[PDB]
Amino acid sequence: LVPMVIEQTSRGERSFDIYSRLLKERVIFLTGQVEDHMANLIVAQMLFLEAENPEKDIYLYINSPGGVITAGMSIYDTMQFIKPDVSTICMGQAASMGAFLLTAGAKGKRFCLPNSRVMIHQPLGGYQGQATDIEIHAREILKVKGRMNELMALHTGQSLEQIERDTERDRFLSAPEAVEYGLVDSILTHRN
Amino acid sequence: LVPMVIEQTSRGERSFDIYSRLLKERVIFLTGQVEDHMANLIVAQMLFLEAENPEKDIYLYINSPGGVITAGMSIYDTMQFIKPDVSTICMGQAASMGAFLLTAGAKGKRFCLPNSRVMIHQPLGGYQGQATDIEIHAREILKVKGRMNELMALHTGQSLEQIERDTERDRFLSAPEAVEYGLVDSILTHRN
Amino acid sequence: LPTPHEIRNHLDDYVIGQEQAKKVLAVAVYNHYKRLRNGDTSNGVELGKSNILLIGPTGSGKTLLAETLARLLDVPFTMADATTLTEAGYVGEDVENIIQKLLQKSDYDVQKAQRGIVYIDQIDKISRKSDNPSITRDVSGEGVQQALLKLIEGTVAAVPPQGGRKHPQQEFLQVDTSKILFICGGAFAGLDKVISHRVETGSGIGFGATVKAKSDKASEGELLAQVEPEDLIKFGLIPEFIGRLPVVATLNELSEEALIQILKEPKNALTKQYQALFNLEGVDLEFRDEALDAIAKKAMARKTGARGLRSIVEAALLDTMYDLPSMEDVEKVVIDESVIDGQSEPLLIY
Amino acid sequence: CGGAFAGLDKVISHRVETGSGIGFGATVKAKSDKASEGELLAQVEPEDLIKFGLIPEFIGRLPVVATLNELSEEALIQILKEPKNALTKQYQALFNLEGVDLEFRDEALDAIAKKAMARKTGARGLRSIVEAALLDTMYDLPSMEDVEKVVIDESVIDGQSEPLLIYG
Amino acid sequence: LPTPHEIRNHLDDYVIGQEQAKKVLAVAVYNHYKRLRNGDTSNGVELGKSNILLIGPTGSGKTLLAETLARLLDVPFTMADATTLTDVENIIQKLLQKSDYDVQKAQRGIVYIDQIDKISRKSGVQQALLKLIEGTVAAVPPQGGRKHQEFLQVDTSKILFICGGAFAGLDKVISHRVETGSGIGFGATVKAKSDKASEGELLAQVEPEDLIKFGLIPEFIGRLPVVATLNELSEEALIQILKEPKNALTKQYQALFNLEGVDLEFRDEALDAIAKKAMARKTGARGLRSIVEAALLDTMYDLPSMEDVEKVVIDESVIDGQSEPLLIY
Ligand SMILES: Nc1ncnc2c1ncn2[C@@H]1O[C@H](COP(=O)(O)OP(=O)(O)OP(O)(O)=S)[C@@H](O)[C@H]1O
Ligand SMILES: Nc1ncnc2c1ncn2[C@@H]1O[C@H](COP(=O)(O)OP(=O)(O)O)[C@@H](O)[C@H]1O
């Protein structure tokens, strides 16, 4: 269920859902697994805000255990293409793909909660068939792993070799460690 | 099904759902298992109330058997970040994570019903794979247990050593014992 | 008698960066003087009156155009409002109120009322709101336009002259309205989106569609030039009401650079006012280009920047003006951009 | 008592149309192929006005009724020449006092008709088209001297050309 | 003739806590006087009329500024009001009567209008004053006439006019414009109960457009471009108004008992608490009598019956009402 709220305006009272009200303030929610449907819905939200105002900062709250890679890369290109600075925040957890979209936000406008947790690993895949087909899908997923490490280093500032060693296996990073790693800029402990 | 009610206002009559009516009075409901979707919805409600009024106390009624840890920790940091005092009430039951969010409320504004029951235990998990990966996930869940015990002592006032011994296994706490343990402030037996 | 070239030359002193609107108005006013001056009792009679419809952004100088024209113009001028009006004897205001307001400018002379011109602002605010199951009789909406139809075309309405000292008079004057000119204009909201969909391209939200990057970099004005009556129908106006106003004006926009021109070229520019205020004291006022640029940004940040120039300029010189009489042997005053921000104090020359 | 009623054709359409059932046994009637607005209002009766909102008592006080056809492209051409108070003759007198003549060729009036219907404003919306064309001319005409005639061609309406002026 | 610095010192005796207000009036008054005395044939032709409109908080002392300026200025002064609501010529007649039928001196006299908000667009007398501020002649019967008929024409273009009135609800209109939106997320800041919504720091950013929303006509506002903000009050002002002025209530009641052979005292420890009580009522100095009279009520009631009370001392507790005032025998 979704609660309904009332927003008071000069013209009159209007009823809005909790998610649509925050959308009016340039706020988008990324919840659950990243799939083709959930990702395609967020893209339309970002584009809608661009037309309304291309000079106002956008806030993206992420709480998800990750998911499909191809669905997530469509969002990454969108954040970089549009002019507004896409602020990212990590709430609860940020998996492999959730971490890539987190660090891809605008520099200086990336935050993580004091008790949040980030996890990064290498891309997962698999195939069943002839040996010739396995080699094709193996070369393809290898390029993605190399591509995902290059972009992660670009925003984090770390070296490509360091990201390769840290992404060989699952690696959990606490909220303070993310700052030291260049993944985020600060922590929003209290309101000032 | 959700019943519909009518709220009389100066402008005119408006029809509201039972959950939205209480939301207008700074009341949020935490029902069922704690997951990424249910937790992400409550966070938006708290933020909505902050903008409407940052000086009025918020009341959070909790009746849940617990759930995912990462989803609940996003709520804890939110309650501490915002300025308003988040009053917490335990109705029916408060599991490991439900108890952590209950005690995390503002000091002096935490209550428990006369027949409510609280249960606390250590984090649960598991993994299947190589031994190298099991060691990583074991260290991660160990940090959470240490972090969850530190915060429990901070709000409950007890020592970290006491929380460690009491959280080794499931421990049920009646409503009166919760007061003696520093977990809550009083009991709302009757209206005065 | 007034020649369109001569009247336009005079208006250029008071208006900057608006040319199309000047040509449109000059022809109408010249025809109006000619229509009222010439008896017209020839083979052709009852010459038609082309009413003017002014369109432009808020704070573009519409009120100044009518008032500055009224200053040099001999006939009286009034500034009414459409939002106050409410049809069929409602709480807000009767239509007849506009006529009685005109007589005060005309000193209660009926012959002078036909000579004068009328101006209305915020005409777009009475756009036909179209919500089907709410009232179906929009007093603020369409309903107001129906009442103005007969007014603009021409009719005689009873008007108590001067209001009357007491019941004793109990009489009313007959005032014609056919020969009276009407200038109804207001900044329409959302009109740019209406014409973009039908005229230029597949713009909007999507990637390939042209985004609104030029929010302030470029002027939307050029789009308004291609406006037509059919587009106003979608806005809410009735075709009958539009037929009463055949002429149309664009008034594209005001530019940051134009603000600098407004402070130097016009006769009534603020720079010339303060310059003469200090000239009598044996002091000179110097404005630098850097100082003007800072003023433009501050005015642009606030709403109705054109109307906010007085506040920015007055605050900057308020402190200096207080100490100028006290100070002696000071012949010049220099203002810098830093002073406009408030971090610096103007330089003084002895 | 007379005023332009809006939407009356939709009400008249419902009554004039016989109506039919959508099922198999119910017969279907093919009618109202064209709007025939002018020919449709002629079939008006008091009962239709009751559904529109008028009270029968008020209509009973008005036994007679008049249906007016909507002017067409050809109707406007005659309105610009035959009537004495036509707009064309108005400007002719406007320039006569100025010692200049005015002319309106048939090719220019045909184009005005198509533009008038395009604006869905009727005869009252015709001045918008005329003043828009003669705008440039009227701006420099008083200052101009030794000009005895003005001709408005079809191109001037489109804006490609300017009206031809004869010096004499 | 007088300069802003010297005129400020004279006004300071009667004006306190309104320093910025003095600057606006000093420049306006000096500028206005020079406009009348200058050749008026300079390159800077059609000089905009300099008229000042006072922003009136309830009981903010606007009447004081006019009286102090009027008393200090040798030119005649008149106290007009918009209650007439049509008949404006009578206001002009009043100035001449003080002036003793002298048009010259009358020209140099400035008039102050009170309760200008009473004629706002809440329903058109404002349209009549437009012809007055812009300059016109109004018929005035000199001396009223012995019996049944001429009138004197007195110019009005060069006379200055001070139009001010206490506006109600003006803060709410400015709040809508100056709020510039409210945020809901983490990074966006949330306003507290009152940070910038106070009367102070809210009128300085006022502009002509905001007055249009209240009901004022732009023609009327165009004639008054200059505007000066007036602070409401402060704890220091209330402390000084009860001690420095000669007609303060403290000195008045002190004199009431002098004839009765009894003295009264008011310590500073009692007045600071009185200031906190006055601001809570939001009534200014005019609402001060309710506080002082309430405490004295019980005292003055049983004071005649009391005997041997040579002096009475008022402690801070007396204002609270918990403890009765101490009597000195
Ligand atoms: N051409 C111009 N020259 C000088 N000042 C101008 C010019 N155009 C606008 N302004 C300034 O803009 C101010 C407002 O002018 P207005 O005519 O009231 O604008 P506006 O668009 O009519 O505002 P509305 O429609 O009444 S809300 C004037 O007081 C001038 O300071
Ligand atoms: N700064 C001040 N110094 C002395 N008296 C003041 C001051 N401010 C206000 N007053 C007092 O306030 C009264 C004027 O109130 P006023 O502001 O005219 O009320 P209103 O706002 O209703 O017109 C005067 O009697 C005066 O003694």
Side-chain angles (χ1 to χ4, degrees):
Chain A
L1 183 62
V2 194
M4 308 310 301
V5 306
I6 298 305
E7 193 183 3
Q8 292 287 110
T9 74
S10 300
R11 298 166 167 285
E13 55 263 33
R14 206 173 295 97
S15 184
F16 278 112
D17 61 83
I18 194 73
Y19 279 105
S20 164
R21 183 67 171 74
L22 268 51
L23 174 54
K24 195 156 163 285
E25 306 302 333
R26 317 186 64 73
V27 187
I28 291 162
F29 280 107
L30 202 156
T31 189
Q33 300 197 346
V34 177
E35 64 194 349
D36 303 327
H37 301 99
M38 169 48 69
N40 206 344
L41 184 64
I42 282 156
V43 169
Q45 292 172 74
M46 286 179 172
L47 293 160
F48 175 83
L49 297 168
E50 202 183 34
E52 188 174 357
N53 196 305
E55 299 185 1
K56 287 168 77 73
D57 301 359
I58 287 157
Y59 297 93
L60 191 68
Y61 311 147
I62 293 158
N63 180 30
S64 162
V68 180
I69 291 149
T70 58
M73 294 304 309
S74 57
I75 289 158
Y76 165 65
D77 305 334
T78 302
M79 296 156 49
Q80 306 298 344
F81 166 81
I82 68 192
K83 277 161 62 169
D85 294 332
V86 176
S87 192
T88 67
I89 291 164
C90 170
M91 302 205 314
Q93 61 190 20
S96 42
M97 176 46 56
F100 171 73
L101 305 173
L102 188 66
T103 193
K107 202 70 161 286
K109 298 166 178 169
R110 302 179 298 179
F111 312 88
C112 82
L113 263 50
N115 296 258
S116 60
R117 293 207 165 286
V118 189
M119 196 196 89
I120 61 171
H121 59 281
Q122 87 304 355
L124 301 176
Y127 189 89
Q128 302 181 349
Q130 303 294 348
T132 297
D133 297 357
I134 290 157
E135 200 178 7
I136 294 160
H137 290 246
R139 289 161 51 188
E140 174 52 44
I141 188 161
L142 282 161
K143 293 171 184 178
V144 177
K145 178 165 182 172
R147 184 66 177 187
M148 285 291 292
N149 289 337
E150 285 173 357
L151 302 166
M152 283 284 287
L154 172 52
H155 296 297
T156 59
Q158 300 287 1
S159 60
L160 180 58
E161 53 260 34
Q162 187 64 21
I163 299 301
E164 284 166 3
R165 284 189 299 279
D166 285 319
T167 54
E168 175 49 64
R169 302 189 170 287
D170 305 340
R171 186 167 168 72
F172 301 94
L173 286 90
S174 54
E177 189 175 356
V179 167
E180 180 167 4
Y181 210 86
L183 195 147
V184 307
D185 313 304
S186 66
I187 296 162
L188 301 169
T189 61
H190 278 72
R191 190 172 283 283
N192 292 119
Chain B
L1 183 61
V2 175
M4 309 311 303
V5 308
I6 301 306
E7 195 181 8
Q8 295 290 89
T9 58
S10 44
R11 294 164 168 279
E13 55 264 35
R14 212 170 297 99
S15 180
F16 283 103
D17 64 81
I18 194 70
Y19 283 97
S20 163
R21 184 68 179 74
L22 267 55
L23 175 54
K24 208 163 178 290
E25 302 296 341
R26 316 189 66 71
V27 181
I28 290 160
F29 279 111
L30 203 159
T31 312
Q33 292 194 350
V34 174
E35 64 195 349
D36 53 39
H37 293 103
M38 180 60 81
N40 189 35
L41 190 74
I42 286 149
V43 169
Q45 294 190 62
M46 294 182 180
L47 294 153
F48 172 77
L49 298 160
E50 213 186 15
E52 183 168 355
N53 195 312
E55 287 186 3
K56 283 179 81 71
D57 57 5
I58 288 158
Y59 301 89
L60 195 71
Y61 310 146
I62 295 160
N63 179 16
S64 164
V68 177
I69 294 148
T70 59
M73 293 293 292
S74 59
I75 293 153
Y76 160 68
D77 301 340
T78 305
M79 294 150 45
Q80 300 294 343
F81 166 77
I82 65 179
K83 273 171 69 171
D85 288 327
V86 175
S87 183
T88 66
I89 292 165
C90 168
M91 302 193 306
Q93 62 191 11
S96 64
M97 174 48 71
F100 175 77
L101 297 166
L102 191 77
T103 191
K107 202 73 161 285
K109 295 171 173 168
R110 304 180 296 182
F111 312 89
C112 82
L113 263 56
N115 296 259
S116 47
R117 296 206 157 287
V118 183
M119 198 206 77
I120 57 179
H121 65 289
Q122 88 301 3
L124 288 166
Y127 192 88
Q128 301 189 340
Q130 305 300 337
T132 301
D133 299 327
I134 290 153
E135 189 172 8
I136 294 158
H137 287 249
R139 288 164 56 184
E140 167 49 63
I141 186 165
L142 280 160
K143 288 175 181 181
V144 175
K145 181 163 183 173
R147 179 56 163 184
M148 283 287 290
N149 289 337
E150 286 163 6
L151 303 168
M152 285 281 285
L154 170 52
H155 298 281
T156 59
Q158 300 281 12
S159 88
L160 188 64
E161 303 176 4
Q162 187 66 10
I163 298 298
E164 281 177 358
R165 283 192 297 281
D166 303 336
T167 56
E168 270 285 6
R169 304 192 171 284
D170 61 334
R171 183 173 167 73
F172 289 83
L173 281 81
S174 60
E177 191 173 357
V179 170
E180 183 169 2
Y181 206 83
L183 197 144
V184 299
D185 312 307
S186 64
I187 295 161
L188 297 165
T189 60
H190 283 67
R191 194 178 274 282
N192 305 125
Chain C
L1 260 66
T3 309
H5 283 266
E6 294 181 358
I7 195 180
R8 185 260 186 196
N9 176 28
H10 200 302
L11 291 154
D12 209 330
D13 301 3
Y14 290 69
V15 174
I16 312 294
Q18 298 202 316
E19 288 78 353
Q20 186 64 13
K22 297 175 168 154
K23 297 178 165 191
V24 168
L25 298 158
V27 171
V29 300
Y30 164 75
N31 292 357
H32 186 94
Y33 305 165
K34 184 156 54 163
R35 278 195 316 279
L36 281 172
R37 165 163 150 284
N38 188 42
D40 293 319
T41 57
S42 65
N43 48 7
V45 307
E46 295 180 2
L47 303 179
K49 67 193 200 164
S50 46
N51 267 296
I52 294 160
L53 165 52
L54 289 185
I55 292 161
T58 314
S60 189
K62 305 187 299 310
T63 315
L64 287 182
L65 179 135
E67 278 288 357
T68 56
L69 167 47
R71 283 174 191 179
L72 65 93
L73 176 49
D74 308 329
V75 301
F77 170 72
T78 192
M79 178 171 189
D81 189 3
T83 64
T84 63
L85 301 173
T86 50
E87 58 154 17
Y90 272 45
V91 63
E93 193 69 8
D94 273 297
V95 174
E96 72 203 49
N97 167 45
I98 286 151
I99 307 307
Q100 57 177 1
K101 288 165 71 170
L102 175 53
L103 266 52
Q104 278 84 60
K105 303 295 191 299
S106 295
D107 76 89
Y108 311 100
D109 176 285
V110 175
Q111 173 48 227
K112 280 281 183 169
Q114 302 180 123
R115 295 267 162 74
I117 317 302
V118 175
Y119 166 72
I120 296 159
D121 53 357
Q122 303 183 341
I123 195 73
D124 74 313
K125 208 63 52 170
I126 53 165
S127 62
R128 175 168 66 165
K129 302 294 187 184
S130 307
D131 45 340
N132 179 26
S134 315
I135 312 294
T136 315
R137 271 187 73 74
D138 282 9
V139 57
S140 178
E142 195 185 352
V144 187
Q145 284 157 223
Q146 285 173 352
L148 297 161
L149 290 168
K150 185 61 68 74
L151 184 66
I152 292 149
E153 192 170 357
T155 191
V156 288
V159 179
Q162 315 185 340
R165 300 183 297 280
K166 277 299 191 189
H167 65 101
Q169 56 100 35
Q170 192 59 256
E171 45 175 355
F172 310 92
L173 309 198
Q174 306 303 89
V175 183
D176 303 330
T177 54
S178 74
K179 291 135 70 170
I180 295 173
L181 179 62
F182 279 71
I183 289 161
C184 320
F188 290 80
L191 177 52
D192 308 65
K193 302 198 304 312
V194 173
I195 293 156
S196 285
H197 291 327
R198 137 180 181 286
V199 174
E200 188 162 276
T201 188
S203 316
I205 292 96
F207 288 99
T210 292
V211 63
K212 192 54 52 170
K214 305 164 276 168
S215 309
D216 42 18
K217 299 109 176 183
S219 313
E220 56 81 15
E222 296 97 295
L223 179 147
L224 290 160
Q226 296 85 243
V227 71
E228 292 187 7
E230 182 171 6
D231 296 19
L232 309 194
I233 305 305
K234 294 187 179 180
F235 209 103
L237 290 169
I238 307 160
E240 184 72 354
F241 189 90
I242 294 155
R244 297 283 205 284
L245 294 95
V247 190
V248 304
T250 58
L251 278 84
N252 46 25
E253 209 165 6
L254 62 86
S255 181
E256 293 187 353
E257 303 182 355
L259 277 299
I260 291 150
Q261 305 186 33
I262 285 163
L263 297 168
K264 302 174 75 172
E265 272 287 1
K267 296 155 59 52
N268 203 45
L270 312 183
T271 62
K272 297 186 182 170
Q273 296 176 18
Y274 302 118
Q275 272 170 1
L277 191 64
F278 308 144
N279 272 126
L280 61 94
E281 206 71 5
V283 192
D284 201 333
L285 195 63
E286 188 188 24
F287 277 110
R288 306 179 70 269
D289 282 30
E290 297 190 344
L292 311 200
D293 166 71
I295 296 162
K297 303 194 188 303
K298 294 283 283 297
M300 273 288 185
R302 63 182 69 267
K303 293 179 179 179
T304 317
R307 280 191 215 203
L309 313 186
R310 294 298 214 88
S311 75
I312 292 158
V313 170
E314 285 285 1
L317 317 188
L318 172 51
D319 56 353
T320 298
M321 277 188 299
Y322 197 101
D323 308 328
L324 199 70
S326 55
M327 285 184 295
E328 188 59 22
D329 193 358
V330 175
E331 304 296 314
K332 206 187 174 191
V333 174
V334 187
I335 297 87
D336 204 298
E337 67 181 2
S338 56
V339 170
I340 300 302
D341 299 66
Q343 292 87 79
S344 169
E345 292 177 350
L347 298 171
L348 319 176
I349 310 305
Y350 309 89
Chain D
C1 310
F5 279 76
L8 207 76
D9 49 349
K10 279 82 171 189
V11 170
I12 297 151
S13 65
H14 189 25
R15 196 275 309 287
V16 64
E17 72 92 33
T18 55
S20 160
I22 296 155
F24 287 89
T27 180
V28 63
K29 279 290 199 180
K31 60 200 165 287
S32 315
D33 54 294
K34 307 326 303 168
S36 314
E37 292 173 358
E39 207 274 327
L40 200 81
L41 285 153
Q43 324 186 51
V44 70
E45 295 291 351
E47 66 195 348
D48 284 15
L49 305 182
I50 309 310
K51 301 187 177 183
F52 188 83
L54 275 74
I55 302 159
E57 297 166 357
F58 179 67
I59 290 162
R61 302 285 188 287
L62 271 57
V64 194
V65 295
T67 290
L68 288 86
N69 301 315
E70 186 175 5
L71 52 80
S72 298
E73 202 189 358
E74 306 178 5
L76 298 175
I77 303 301
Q78 199 77 72
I79 288 160
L80 293 150
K81 294 144 59 167
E82 166 164 11
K84 60 173 73 175
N85 74 313
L87 303 173
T88 64
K89 291 197 178 178
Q90 286 178 343
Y91 300 128
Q92 280 172 33
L94 200 74
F95 301 159
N96 175 35
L97 60 92
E98 211 73 3
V100 195
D101 196 288
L102 192 59
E103 192 177 8
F104 275 119
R105 297 188 159 283
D106 50 8
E107 292 180 354
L109 316 189
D110 301 329
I112 290 161
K114 289 185 182 175
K115 298 296 291 295
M117 286 190 294
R119 288 173 148 66
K120 312 294 172 179
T121 316
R124 220 177 281 92
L126 193 147
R127 288 210 192 80
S128 61
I129 285 154
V130 170
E131 299 219 329
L134 318 189
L135 203 78
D136 52 0
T137 299
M138 277 195 279
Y139 171 74
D140 55 0
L141 210 69
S143 300
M144 271 163 181
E145 300 180 0
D146 206 75
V147 193
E148 54 176 344
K149 193 176 173 185
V150 178
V151 173
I152 300 103
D153 303 325
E154 166 165 7
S155 44
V156 179
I157 309 312
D158 310 278
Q160 299 163 19
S161 177
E162 292 177 350
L164 174 54
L165 306 97
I166 311 308
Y167 300 84
Chain E
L1 180 60
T3 57
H5 287 254
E6 68 189 54
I7 193 169
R8 152 168 290 186
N9 307 129
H10 189 278
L11 298 163
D12 182 68
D13 194 68
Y14 321 122
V15 177
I16 45 169
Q18 299 291 359
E19 296 181 349
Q20 195 175 357
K22 295 184 190 176
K23 303 209 171 186
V24 183
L25 303 176
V27 172
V29 168
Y30 165 72
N31 288 346
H32 165 64
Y33 277 6
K34 183 69 216 190
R35 276 209 317 288
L36 308 202
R37 202 174 56 72
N38 64 12
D40 269 298
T41 79
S42 67
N43 63 340
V45 298
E46 73 183 300
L47 299 170
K49 301 295 187 177
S50 69
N51 286 252
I52 181 62
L53 66 93
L54 296 169
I55 306 306
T58 303
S60 52
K62 58 180 66 51
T63 310
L64 184 63
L65 303 179
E67 292 289 276
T68 57
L69 183 58
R71 285 175 193 170
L72 169 56
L73 290 175
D74 61 318
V75 306
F77 63 98
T78 194
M79 185 166 185
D81 287 315
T83 63
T84 305
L85 192 59
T86 75
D87 191 12
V88 306
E89 66 277 16
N90 71 345
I91 290 148
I92 292 154
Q93 186 193 13
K94 276 141 61 168
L95 188 69
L96 270 287
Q97 289 289 311
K98 312 303 181 180
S99 178
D100 199 329
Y101 317 99
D102 189 82
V103 71
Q104 171 47 227
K105 290 287 181 194
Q107 186 61 264
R108 301 175 65 78
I110 308 90
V111 310
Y112 53 98
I113 307 90
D114 311 332
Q115 309 191 30
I116 196 71
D117 80 317
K118 177 56 178 64
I119 54 162
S120 58
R121 186 173 49 71
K122 278 194 176 180
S123 309
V125 73
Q126 290 181 358
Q127 285 295 332
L129 314 189
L130 294 172
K131 294 227 290 189
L132 169 55
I133 303 300
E134 71 86 21
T136 190
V137 305
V140 189
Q143 300 90 37
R146 297 166 66 77
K147 285 196 83 178
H148 295 64
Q149 191 66 344
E150 60 186 50
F151 310 107
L152 308 190
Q153 301 297 348
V154 292
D155 201 323
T156 63
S157 83
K158 301 267 176 170
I159 293 100
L160 184 58
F161 301 90
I162 292 161
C163 305
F167 314 103
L170 173 55
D171 60 332
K172 291 285 286 191
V173 169
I174 297 146
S175 304
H176 291 56
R177 186 175 65 80
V178 303
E179 71 197 346
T180 68
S182 88
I184 292 161
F186 303 102
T189 193
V190 187
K191 195 179 181 180
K193 175 46 57 189
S194 286
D195 285 4
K196 192 251 170 187
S198 44
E199 293 289 357
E201 312 184 358
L202 185 66
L203 312 177
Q205 309 91 334
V206 77
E207 310 296 349
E209 188 170 3
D210 306 337
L211 287 76
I212 296 296
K213 301 178 188 294
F214 199 101
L216 274 67
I217 305 152
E219 270 66 0
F220 203 104
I221 288 152
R223 299 285 173 284
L224 297 89
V226 189
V227 63
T229 77
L230 193 76
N231 187 14
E232 188 172 7
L233 289 185
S234 73
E235 293 92 332
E236 309 305 332
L238 290 167
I239 289 157
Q240 297 170 41
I241 292 151
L242 286 153
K243 184 60 170 177
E244 276 288 1
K246 64 190 79 177
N247 70 302
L249 294 172
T250 64
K251 303 179 184 178
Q252 281 178 12
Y253 287 109
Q254 274 165 5
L256 178 55
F257 303 144
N258 293 175
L259 63 92
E260 211 72 0
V262 185
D263 202 73
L264 184 60
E265 311 190 349
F266 278 111
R267 308 306 186 76
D268 283 29
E269 281 72 5
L271 313 196
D272 53 1
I274 287 165
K276 305 182 194 303
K277 297 287 283 294
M279 294 177 289
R281 302 177 83 85
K282 300 287 186 172
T283 317
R286 200 173 272 97
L288 197 142
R289 296 210 190 183
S290 159
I291 290 158
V292 167
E293 290 192 17
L296 298 163
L297 169 64
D298 294 1
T299 305
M300 288 195 295
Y301 156 73
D302 60 349
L303 182 62
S305 54
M306 283 160 168
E307 63 92 25
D308 198 68
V309 180
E310 201 167 4
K311 178 162 75 171
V312 174
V313 173
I314 311 309
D315 315 328
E316 183 267 318
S317 67
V318 177
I319 302 303
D320 307 330
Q322 300 162 333
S323 159
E324 292 177 350
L326 169 61
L327 277 61
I328 316 303
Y329 299 85

